[PDB]
Amino acid sequence: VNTAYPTPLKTILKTTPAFVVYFVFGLGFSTVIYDVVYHPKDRIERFYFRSSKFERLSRKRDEKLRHYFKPAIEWQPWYNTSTNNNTRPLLRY
Amino acid sequence: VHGEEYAQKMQKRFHQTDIWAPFRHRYAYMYNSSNKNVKDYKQVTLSRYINGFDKFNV
Ligand SMILES: CCCCCCCCCCCCCCCCCC(=O)OC[C@H](COP(=O)([O-])OCC(O)COP(=O)([O-])OC[C@@H](COC(=O)CCCCCCCCCCCCCCCCC)OC(=O)CCCCCCCCCCCCCCCCC)OC(=O)CCCCCCCCCCCCCCCCC
Numbered sequence: 001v002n003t004a005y006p007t008p009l010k011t012i013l014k015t016t017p018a019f020v021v022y023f024v025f026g027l028g029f030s031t032v033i034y035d036v037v038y039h040p041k042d043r044i045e046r047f048y049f050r051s052s053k054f055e056r057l058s059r060k061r062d063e064k065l066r067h068y069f070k071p072a073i074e075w076q077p078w079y080n081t082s083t084n085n086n087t088r089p090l091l092r093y
Numbered sequence: 094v095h096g097e098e099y100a101q102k103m104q105k106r107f108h109q110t111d112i113w114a115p116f117r118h119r120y121a122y123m124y125n126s127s128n129k130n131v132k133d134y135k136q137v138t139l140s141r142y143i144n145g146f147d148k149f150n151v
């Protein structure tokens with residue numbers, strides 16, 4: 001009872017370890033990318049352009065308020081740095 | 094300081110006030126006239142790799 005592999009399958013299996021090593025490296029690369037992009041946001045945030053106009057506005061409202069509105073409304077003549085190293089305009093001209 | 098009439102003349106911009114035309118140095122084009130990165134360049138670069146820059150709008 002020689003329960004050996006079929007000849008075609010045995011021939012094919014020779015190159016399998018290369019496939020396994022490729023899968024190891026590819027999973028490592030994909031997981032590294034996933035973790036690098038996941039840690040800062042604590043999630044896989046959808047791309048900005050993959051969203052409706054209203055969704056984009058709602059997403060960026062808080063950032064606009066925290067970065068521009070508050071400094072704009074709390075501005076004082078002596079808050080600006082004398083070195084002209086101020087924040088750039090939101091729409092640069 | 095120069096005069097109330099002078100200040101009023103400087104501020105007035107349109108004869109007919111039924112139309113609202115906000116002043117803009119330029120008009121947004123990309124991303125359906127929106128801003129993808131409402132941040133500084135340093136924040137834009139770092140926030141893609143460093144935690145704490147995103148404020149979790151929920
Ligand atoms: C000897 C004498 C002694 C010497 C001592 C030397 C000095 C020692 C250190 C001294 C100082 C210590 C200070 C400690 C206190 C301060 C710590 C601090 O500041 O951090 C806080 C800081 C923020 O605080 P926190 O928010 O509370 O942190 C919680 C998490 O961040 C919350 O995470 P999350 O829920 O948001 O999930 C995301 C998280 C979760 O992601 C993970 O980190 C989990 C693991 C992800 C997958 C890893 C797969 C690895 C294998 C892939 C296949 C490789 C095949 C090819 C290579 C051959 C392999 C045999 O990932 C990330 O955040 C992105 C990090 C990406 C890391 C890059 C990939 C790591 C592998 C590198 C491989 C390099 C090439 C191969 C080299 C081969 C050499 C032969 O934390 C971090 O940022 C953590 C970063 C972790 C990086 C990975 C570390 C290793 C993990 C285990 C795998 C090790 C593999 C080794 C292979 C060796 C082969 C031979």
Ligand SMILES: CCCCCCCCCCCCCCCCCC(=O)OC[C@H](COP(=O)([O-])OCC[N+](C)(C)C)OC(=O)CCCCCCCCCCCCCCCCC
Binds near residue numbers: 142143144145
């Ligand atoms: C013959 C020698 C062969 C050497 C083979 C080595 C191959 C290359 C391996 C590179 C990947 C190594 C990953 C190790 C873990 C890194 C963790 C980390 O940086 O924390 C991120 C974390 C991210 O955490 P975070 O994003 O929360 O940080 C922000 C934190 N707040 C918000 C509070 C500000 O960053 C920090 O911990 C901050 C301090 C970073 C300090 C600089 C780290 C540099 C690491 C260099 C490693 C070089 C290893 C050389 C080994 C040589 C051996 C001979």
